[PDB]
Amino acid sequence: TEEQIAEFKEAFSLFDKDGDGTITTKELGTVMRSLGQNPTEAELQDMINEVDADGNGTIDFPEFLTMMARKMKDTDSEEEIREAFRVFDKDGNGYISAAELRHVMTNLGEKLTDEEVDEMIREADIDGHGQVNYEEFVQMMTA
Amino acid sequence: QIPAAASLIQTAWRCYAAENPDSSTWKIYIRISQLREHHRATIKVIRRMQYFVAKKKFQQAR
Ligand SMILES: [Ca+2]
Ligand SMILES: [Ca+2]
What we know:
It is classed as metal binding protein. The complex is a heterodimer. Chain A is mainly alpha-helical.
C-alpha cells in the first residue's frame, strides 16, 4: 500500500528472469534450484495454480500482489491448522506426544530438520507427561 | 489425509519461523554460502506459496 509496492516489484522481478511481466513454472523452478531445492514439475504447477487467478498458467504482477497480500493468520487458517493437528490426536484430548510430533514433523510431508523440530518443541511448552498442547502452537503461529 | 495434515503444519511453521531472522530454519539453505537479504526475501515468497498450496490440499482431504 505504500513502499511495499516497490519491494514487491523488486521481489517479483527476481522471479521474472526474461522481463516479460510474467512468471512461469520454469522461472519459479530456476529460483528454487538456485536455493538448492529440487522441485518437481508437479510442485511447480501447484504453486503457480494457487496464485494464477485467470487460469492462463502464469503469474502477472497483480496476481503476485494478491498472494503477497493474502492473510495468513486469519480465522480460517487458524481452524485449518487446528484440524491438521487433530488428525494426529485420535482421542481428541487436545494433546500430542512430543515423540509422535517429532516423528510426524521429521518423517512425513516436507520433513523438517532435527534442529527445526527442536525449535518447534522448545516453544511448545511440554507438560509433565511428554505431551504437547497443540492449541498453543496454533495460537502462537496465528498471533 | 495424514500427509496433507503433516504438510500444512510444516509449511505453516516454516512461514512462522522465517519471521525470526535467527531461527534454525535459515540453516537449511546449504547451497548458499552466505545468506543475503535478497535471499531471505525470495525464500519468504516461496514459503508463503508452499503454505497456500498445502492449505488447499488439506482443505480437499479434510
Ligand atoms: Ca517471465
Ligand atoms: Ca495468470
